[PDB]
Amino acid sequence: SHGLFKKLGIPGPTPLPFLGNILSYHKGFCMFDMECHKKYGKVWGFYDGQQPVLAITDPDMIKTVLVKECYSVFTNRRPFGPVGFMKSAISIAEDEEWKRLRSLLSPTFTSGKLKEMVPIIAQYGDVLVRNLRREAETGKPVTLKDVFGAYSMDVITSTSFGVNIDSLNNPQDPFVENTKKLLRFDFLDPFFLSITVFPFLIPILEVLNICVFPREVTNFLRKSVKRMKESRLVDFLQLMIDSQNSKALSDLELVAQSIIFIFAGYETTSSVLSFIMYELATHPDVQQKLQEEIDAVLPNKAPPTYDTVLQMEYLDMVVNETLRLFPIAMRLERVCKKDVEINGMFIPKGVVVMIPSYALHRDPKYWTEPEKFLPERFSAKNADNIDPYIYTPFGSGPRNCIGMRFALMNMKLALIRVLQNFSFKPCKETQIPLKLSLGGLLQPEKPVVLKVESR
Amino acid sequence: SHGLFKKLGIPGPTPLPFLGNILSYHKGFCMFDMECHKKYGKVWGFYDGQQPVLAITDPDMIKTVLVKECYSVFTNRRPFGPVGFMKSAISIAEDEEWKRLRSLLSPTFTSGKLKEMVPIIAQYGDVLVRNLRREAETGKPVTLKDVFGAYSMDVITSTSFGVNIDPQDPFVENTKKLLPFFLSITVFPFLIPILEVLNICVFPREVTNFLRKSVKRMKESRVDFLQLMIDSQNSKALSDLELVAQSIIFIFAGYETTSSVLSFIMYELATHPDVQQKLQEEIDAVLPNKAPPTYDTVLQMEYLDMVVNETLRLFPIAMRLERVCKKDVEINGMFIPKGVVVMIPSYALHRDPKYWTEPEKFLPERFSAKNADNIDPYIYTPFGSGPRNCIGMRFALMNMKLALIRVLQNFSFKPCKETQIPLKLSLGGLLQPEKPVVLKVESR
Ligand code: HEM
Ligand code: HEM
Ligand SMILES: O=C(CNC(=O)c1cccnc1)N[C@H](CS[C@H](Cc1ccccc1)C(=O)NCCCc1cccnc1)Cc1ccccc1
Ligand SMILES: O=C(CNC(=O)c1cccnc1)N[C@H](CS[C@H](Cc1ccccc1)C(=O)NCCCc1cccnc1)Cc1ccccc1
């Protein structure tokens, strides 16, 4: 297949036999997408082994892939395996199975259901302050991925299942310990390396009961959800139970969706919160102006409500600019299920159309000083000059992030209660500037550590 | 994965791990489908390794799979590999590559193109009589599949290519050795991409080479089956490799399927002299003085059509009809998951006691116009049904009847000492006799 992009006249790095272009992943997804966007321009193609991957940067062509031709052509993501029973996960399901799951899980995050979660989240916002207060009274450094991960785990377990697992910590909580090692995509591990280079090994491992998710971690979550069924005694757990007592969702598919919601609520929320606090500490002018707005909307440390959060404009600018610099998904991918020609470009069946979100968020031909943290890009004065198909931190189209509004509300509800009582400073041991992990997923090399001062 | 039919509540034999129910194939596909038809009923399921196979016998449900939901759900047969360049064959292609090839090769056997083949076939009918005359003047039993196979090869090579090939012809020798270890692919579905990506096939590379370079030799020009594929090639489109893939299918089907059924017909005529004599009296009536058979005189003979239909009932060479359920459906109030191979036991249905009175008996009167109203077109399916039935059903029926007419005008067939009576079917995979069909040929 290594002559496909040579046939279509599409530029790209020369692929090696069998390997393709995976040798260029030594710097990670991001640095590889950045160099390819500069060298080859608006459209380039490479090979993840024998898999041709077409990278597009045109907003109109991105809109056609993500929005217009979603249900008909670009419906599924890249086939990920071996998954085993997790194939029924909404992020992994395909075609009609995903269509049924998306409609089944869409009412989970309506504006009414989200507003019901604010009082529940307000409880753990108080525990977050007291846990930050013990470490604040001492000059001891604070690992923010630990304290934000515990807060995120409590919000996702109570708002989706109505169960309190982390009672003020319990810092050795088993849900965090298992969700931590739930998945570790590292190019170094020849497993995920050989899966991409030689994909015919997937049906071997599937029949061998081999799964990319570890057994002890799946078992802990598989039996916890079975324990989490306490009826007799409307949430993410009730929407699936009610539809189950009416195809329908089996007790194994109901667990598969819970694992996706638990991981996304823990890992993604805690990672972005750590990225936000790093920029607030390295930019004291932004942190002060954000604290001044929070006090103006919530005087005397007033409790945050669903309406006051949507009122804070500068808070939305800080969250959006951090998501621009750090798109945790990095890439958006769709599988071309049939031959099409979008915007005057033929795309064969089976080619993976990829949108480099990290490279587009730092494209100099869009963002003035793209490497700099400037929240003024997202002010209502300048937000008109932002293409929603260039800035896609949550994706776009029918298969975007279903928990986008929940993640935005959960993070903003955390930043408010934290900045109401504390200020953040570097520690010298804080890695400045922040080096990104040259591995698979978007993470810092050294964990983000900061000093916490009370007010 | 062997708990699918247990989940769906569909009965069937208990599968062994990895193997499934393939150990029950020691008797053949036929006897396994018949034992499961009486033991379980209208619907049962088994496992060819890890592949669940659902067997349906309800005519309304058979019609839904073969005819109604063909283009939507039941479009392709069981995936067969490793093939290679034969993946483009019309019998193996899937979805749109099949639809484009089904439309390209459909005009090959129209009522006009078939009527053009009668004078061409009439030439080889005389050589068939002369070669049978040499073995009839001298008392020597005649291997029917050899003498019929040589006639069937010259017919398909001329009606599809116009080339004349005329006892050790390399085409018959190479086409026949497409005839063990398939027990593994039935158990190892994951080893198919191991031989596909590595470019390994099941057909030996030389039965393909001899035909791949023969088509490139017959393509030297300078409208038949070959000309239809050249004119569209000179306009997605068809390549010199896909063009060869279709020629192998037509050559094999025209040689092996025609001769095997003709051998089965003459065995029934020899074991039933009253049927052979009555058939000879009809041929002499429509065609007096051994008149040359034409296109219209063949369709006029009713008893000849009744003899061929009863033989294809007793010996359906396809044995089974199979479709792959491409997506979850609920036909006739029965949920069928995606990936299940819906199978129609044609051999078991052609001998169902709840339909055919005395099914093991050879009675051509089942297909008389008085009684042909009591047969279900979805129970008697010797050529399949629906949009993906036998594309050469009309050519095969005409070619075999033209051979039966030219022979029964001059010879009568009697059993020999070495004639296997009753005929034992091959307990292996395909439908064939154990011992070759040998019959005494007496001239008239
Ligand atoms: C800052 C936080 C988050 C960010 C930036 C983010 C980003 C994304 C992105 C870029 C996608 C892919 C969109 C596409 O391919 O078009 C996605 C998918 C998804 N996200 Fe998130 N996400 C976040 C948090 C969450 C949370 C809290 C949940 C809770 C359930 C969640 C659940 C999902 C699911 C289920 C999908 C798959 C959607 C589908 O297949 O229909 N995410 N997310
Ligand atoms: C007594 C002679 C024959 C019998 C009983 C027979 C029977 C069958 C059957 C049962 C099928 C499958 C139908 C289905 O799956 O629904 C089939 C398919 C087919 N037959 Fe035959 N056949 C005969 C002779 C021939 C001949 C002479 C040709 C010449 C080209 C031929 C070409 C084909 C092809 C190309 C297919 C596959 C068509 C497709 O899948 O779209 N057959 N045949
Ligand atoms: O990662 C590949 C396949 N990629 C390759 O094979 C590959 C290899 C080499 C080079 N390029 C590509 N698919 C994934 C889908 S599968 C993966 C499996 C998984 C991983 C972690 C926990 C649970 C299950 C999954 O469900 N994640 C969603 C978790 C929830 C979440 C996470 C983050 C944000 N919101 C929600 C693409 C993807 C989809 C959505 C968001 C991000 C990425
Ligand atoms: O045989 C399986 C796959 N079966 C399994 O894997 C399996 C294994 C164990 C148990 N059950 C199933 N498919 C085949 C399709 S492929 C096969 C390949 C082949 C073989 C011989 C010569 C050339 C190429 C093929 O093109 N034949 C058609 C020849 C023409 C013809 C022949 C006869 C009558 N008319 C026309 C199902 C089939 C289709 C049509 C008719 C009969 C059967």
Residue numbers in the entry:
A (entry chain A): 29 to 261, 269 to 281, 288 to 496
B (entry chain B): 29 to 194, 199 to 211, 218 to 260, 269 to 281, 288 to 496
From the paper:
Drug-metabolizing CYP3A4 is the most abundant hepatic and intestinal CYP isoform that clears over half of administered pharmaceuticals through oxidation. The 57 kDa protein has a large and malleable active site that can accommodate structurally diverse compounds, sometimes two or more at the same time. In some cases, however, a partial loss of CYP3A4 activity can be beneficial, as it could slow down metabolism of co-administered drugs and increase their blood levels. This pharmacoenhancing (boosting) effect is currently utilized in anti-HIV and anti-HCV therapy, where a potent CYP3A4 inhibitor, ritonavir, or its derivative cobicistat is co-administered with antiviral drugs to prevent their quick metabolism and improve therapeutic efficiency. Based on the spectral and inhibitory properties and the ligand-binding modes, we concluded that coordination to the heme is the driving force for the association of ritonavir-like molecules, with the pyridine moiety identified as the strongest heme-ligating group.
